[PDB]
Design a protein around this ligand. Sequence first.
Ligand SMILES: O=c1ccn([C@@H]2O[C@H](CO)[C@@H](O)[C@H]2O)c(=O)[nH]1
Ligand SMILES: O=c1ccn([C@@H]2O[C@H](CO)[C@@H](O)[C@H]2O)c(=O)[nH]1
Ligand SMILES: O=c1ccn([C@@H]2O[C@H](CO)[C@@H](O)[C@H]2O)c(=O)[nH]1
Ligand SMILES: O=c1ccn([C@@H]2O[C@H](CO)[C@@H](O)[C@H]2O)c(=O)[nH]1
Ligand SMILES: O=c1ccn([C@@H]2O[C@H](CO)[C@@H](O)[C@H]2O)c(=O)[nH]1
Ligand SMILES: O=c1ccn([C@@H]2O[C@H](CO)[C@@H](O)[C@H]2O)c(=O)[nH]1
Ligand SMILES: O=c1ccn([C@@H]2O[C@H](CO)[C@@H](O)[C@H]2O)c(=O)[nH]1
Ligand SMILES: [Ca+2]
Ligand SMILES: [Ca+2]
Ligand SMILES: [Ca+2]
Ligand SMILES: [Ca+2]
Ligand SMILES: [Ca+2]
Ligand SMILES: [Ca+2]
Ligand SMILES: [Ca+2]
Ligand SMILES: [Ca+2]
Ligand SMILES: [Ca+2]
Ligand SMILES: [Ca+2]
Ligand SMILES: [Ca+2]
Lengths: 62, 62, 62, 62, 62, 62, 62
Amino acid sequence: GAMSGRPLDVLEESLEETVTVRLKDGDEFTGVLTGYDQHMNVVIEGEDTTIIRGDNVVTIKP
Amino acid sequence: GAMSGRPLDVLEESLEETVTVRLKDGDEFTGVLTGYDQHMNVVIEGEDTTIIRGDNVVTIKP
Amino acid sequence: GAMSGRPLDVLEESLEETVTVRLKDGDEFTGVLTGYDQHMNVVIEGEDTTIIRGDNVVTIKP
Amino acid sequence: GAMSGRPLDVLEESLEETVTVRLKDGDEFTGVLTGYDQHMNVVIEGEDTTIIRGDNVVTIKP
Amino acid sequence: GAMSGRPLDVLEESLEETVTVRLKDGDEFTGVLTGYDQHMNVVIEGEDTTIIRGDNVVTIKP
Amino acid sequence: GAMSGRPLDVLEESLEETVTVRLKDGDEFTGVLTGYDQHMNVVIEGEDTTIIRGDNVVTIKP
Amino acid sequence: GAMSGRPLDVLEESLEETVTVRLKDGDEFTGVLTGYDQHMNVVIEGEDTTIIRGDNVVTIKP
Ligand SMILES: O=c1ccn([C@@H]2O[C@H](CO)[C@@H](O)[C@H]2O)c(=O)[nH]1
Ligand SMILES: O=c1ccn([C@@H]2O[C@H](CO)[C@@H](O)[C@H]2O)c(=O)[nH]1
Ligand SMILES: O=c1ccn([C@@H]2O[C@H](CO)[C@@H](O)[C@H]2O)c(=O)[nH]1
Ligand SMILES: O=c1ccn([C@@H]2O[C@H](CO)[C@@H](O)[C@H]2O)c(=O)[nH]1
Ligand SMILES: O=c1ccn([C@@H]2O[C@H](CO)[C@@H](O)[C@H]2O)c(=O)[nH]1
Ligand SMILES: O=c1ccn([C@@H]2O[C@H](CO)[C@@H](O)[C@H]2O)c(=O)[nH]1
Ligand SMILES: O=c1ccn([C@@H]2O[C@H](CO)[C@@H](O)[C@H]2O)c(=O)[nH]1
Ligand SMILES: [Ca+2]
Ligand SMILES: [Ca+2]
Ligand SMILES: [Ca+2]
Ligand SMILES: [Ca+2]
Ligand SMILES: [Ca+2]
Ligand SMILES: [Ca+2]
Ligand SMILES: [Ca+2]
Ligand SMILES: [Ca+2]
Ligand SMILES: [Ca+2]
Ligand SMILES: [Ca+2]
Ligand SMILES: [Ca+2]
């Protein structure tokens, strides 16, 4: 198809795996990716759950 | 389905439980989550009711 | 139903009550909430009338 | 109805009357409001005519 | 009508006339308004053509 | 018609010609405009090819 | 057709080819373009997979 492996599809394929999320402020969050949505909001599970709002995200290393 | 546990579905299951919202300006708001919407606007209940506009949120930890 | 006490619904129930609105620039406005819209634009009646563009809002405390 | 006196409805009742618009960069513009739109762009007429793009607006005092 | 003299309608009444556009970075552009769109992108003609993206616009003064 | 010579229409008629794009960070890119889209993403080809995301654009000079 | 070589179409033609993405914070990512979407989110394959959110992108140079 078009668009190759879409970014949200790569996120779909990274469910239940450890990703690292880097935010515009410099902070990094590492933990299991348990959910995401169309805005690139992500749920990251480490010692506890973190919902990260997508507009803060610079990169995700899945 | 697709998307694991969507971020807004994790909010739904955090309703009436305690969460911490961290904003872009550095402020943190702890209290009971009593509502949310599509924009990730949140209602946090401490001694006061605090409506937080979604665009200010960095992370929500339930 | 879903989303608990939706943020805008709490606004609806805060009409004609005193609220405090804090802006990104750190200013605060206290007065009677006489209107709002789906952007979280709000009308605050103090000594005189203030319309606040929602995109400046950080928190609203009803 | 809902939302009380909507922010855009207050601007509707302030057409042909004097208002003060304050901008995110701190400038204020005073004059007769002669038009507006759903983005809250406004037309302010004092000695000059000024179209103000709504995303710059913090407050409007009708 | 509603909304008085809508800001984009003022732009229409300014086509083929000289206006002054002030940007968020402080620069000012004076020239013939030869076009605009619904985002308030404008084409300003001085000694040459300048297309200005609307999200940089603070004010337009016909 | 309305809106005069629309900005995207000026971009159409500047295809295959040389233009200067100035970004919010202050950088400038000069080259032949070989494409654009509704967001004002542009493709500029001088000695190499640069896709510029429209949200960074201040002005384009065709 | 209209719009010449659309920016997203240049991206399509760059799949499985090395490109270089520059971000607003100054960082640069070089690697194989393996995916993209309509927001200009991109997936860049270097030593690791990196998902880049579009709104941080300034330029992409294939
Ligand atoms: O839940 C949401 C909704 C929107 N946005 C993004 O953030 C921008 C500004 O808040 C929006 O335009 C959208 O791209 C999010 O990150 N999360
Ligand atoms: O009530 C609202 C309406 C919009 N937004 C978000 O704020 C962004 C711009 O301020 C919008 O794109 C949207 O994501 C909110 O947070 N709350
Ligand atoms: O009257 C309006 C119209 C829109 N916005 C919203 O402000 C954000 C940034 O301008 C966008 O979400 C936009 O929809 C307002 O705050 N007020
Ligand atoms: O003519 C326009 C078009 C859009 N916007 C608003 O500007 C913000 C983005 O620049 C969004 O809230 C958008 O609705 C305006 O203020 N005026
Ligand atoms: O590829 C894209 C997708 C979206 N946007 C911008 O994102 C904002 C969405 O309202 C607008 O400024 C739009 O031009 C871009 O610049 N490029
Ligand atoms: O071609 C353009 C010019 C301006 N914008 C504005 O940039 C904002 C991005 O926040 C949008 O909401 C819109 O108002 C576009 O989307 N596209
Ligand atoms: O996954 C997403 C979702 C939204 N946006 C951006 O958020 C804004 C929504 O108006 C636009 O700039 C759009 O390109 C992204 O960059 N990536
Ligand atoms: Ca996997
Ligand atoms: Ca799978
Ligand atoms: Ca009054
Ligand atoms: Ca009414
Ligand atoms: Ca009146
Ligand atoms: Ca009329
Ligand atoms: Ca005229
Ligand atoms: Ca003039
Ligand atoms: Ca020319
Ligand atoms: Ca031509
Ligand atoms: Ca080429």
